[PDB]
Amino acid sequence: ECNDPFVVALKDKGYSLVAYPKTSIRPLHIYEHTIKNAFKRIWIQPTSGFIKSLFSDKIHGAIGLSDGRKTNSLSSAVAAKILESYFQDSAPSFDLAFENSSSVIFHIEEIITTDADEISLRNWLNDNQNELREIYKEEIKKGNFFVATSLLRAKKMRMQFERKNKGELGVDVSKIKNLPVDAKLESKITYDRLVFETPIVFGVKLVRLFFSDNGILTIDKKQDFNRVLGENMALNLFTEIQDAGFIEVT
């Protein structure tokens, strides 16, 4: 459980950090939950993952879509494990590349949010429920479907490396073996800065797509309540899904 104010703030709004997107996920798209923090893309025959494609043609609904920090000082070994997990597909090496780094700071700036209207999403699900595909209905009953209701994108992402030894670079780019993204050093002044080129997606908000107790397609846990004007939507967030810390020894 991370204690960094950057991540703690992210879990408050139901966002979960994303590994380097082989897929480049999109808003209002469905993903099946398999194991731990792993997901699988759902393909719906234009074959897509759109949630509107789960229904027929008779849809008269508009889901409101709208396009709208930095970490504490970390030890280099922690920062090494971060990028190891973040780029787990290509398997890069960062072990002793951060030898001259006494502390590292992640910088995630120029944030653009793609936030779908969660209130509109429920009402859209309720009104168009009678048009849901039967083949997808039985799988939705399994409870593993999650709807991406919000995206966190960053135009600028850079890492600051504090020098243990001045005169030597805080990061030794030689020992960066297999990095999927392009990185170059920033202008100097007392510390080294490392920048990564971006067009990306680092955060997603996943809400479970489920049937309530009365059987209504929704994302709200308080669906079957009597409706009051002060009612808040209690989402089934994947950040709320508890994970037993099972360790695996291969």
Rg (CA), the chain: 21
Whole-angstrom distance between the N-terminal and C-terminal Cα of the chain? 23
Specify if 163 maps to a domain. yes
Rounded Cα distance between 80 and 84, Å, is 6
Rounded Cα distance between 222 and 90, Å, is 42
Parallel, antiparallel, or unpaired for β 30-33 and 145-163? antiparallel
Query: Environment class of residue 100 by beta-carbon count within 10 Å: exposed (0-12), middle (13-18) or buried (19+)?
Result: buried
Specify if 97 maps to a domain. yes
Parallel, antiparallel, or unpaired for β 65-67 and 210-211? unpaired
Burial readout 79-89 (b: 16 or more C-beta within 10 A, e: otherwise) = bbebbeebbee
The resolution in angstroms reads: 2.9
Specify if 247 maps to a domain. no
Which residues sit opposite 228 in a β-bridge?
none
Specify if 194 maps to a domain. yes
**Tokens 């168009």 label which residue?**
128
Specify if 144 maps to a domain. yes
Q: Phi, psi at residue 187, to the nearest 5°?
A: -65, 145
Contact call for residues 158 and 107 (beta carbons, < 8 A)? yes
Specify if 145 maps to a domain. yes
Rounded Cα distance between 70 and 10, Å, is 12
Count of alpha carbons within 13 Å of 176, Cβ hemisphere only? 14
Tell me the DSSP string of the chain: ----HHHHHHHHTTEEE----SS---TTBEEEE-STT-EEE--B---B-BSGGGB-S-------EEE--BPPPB-HHHHHHHHHHHTTTT----TTTTTTEEEEEEEEEEEEEEEE-HHHHHHHHHHTGGGB-HHHHHHHTTS-EEEEEEEEEEEEEEEEEEESSTTS-SS-GGG----SS-EEEPP----EEEEE------EEEEEE-EE-TT--EESBTTTTSPP-TTPPP-B-BGGGS---------
Could you list the residue range(s) of the whole structural domain that residue 134 is in? 5-240
Rounded Cα distance between 110 and 113, Å, is 10
**Tokens 């072990």 label which residue?**
95
Rounded Cα distance between 240 and 14, Å, is 8
Specify if 248 maps to a domain. no
Give residues after which the chain gaps, C-N over 2.5 angstroms.
45, 68, 189, 199
Contact call for residues 22 and 89 (beta carbons, < 8 A)? yes
What six digits make up the tokens of 76? 């280099």
- The rounded Cα 247 to chain-centroid distance in angstroms is 23
Angle 80-199-98 (CA atoms, 0-180°, nearest 5)? 15
Count of alpha carbons within 13 Å of 101, Cβ hemisphere only? 26
Nearest to 159 by CA among 181, 183, 180: 183
Number of domains making up the chain: 1
Specify if 213 maps to a domain. yes
Parallel, antiparallel, or unpaired for β 192-196 and 145-163? antiparallel
What six digits make up the tokens of 65? 């879509």
Rounded Cα distance between 64 and 43, Å, is 22
Contact call for residues 132 and 195 (beta carbons, < 8 A)? no
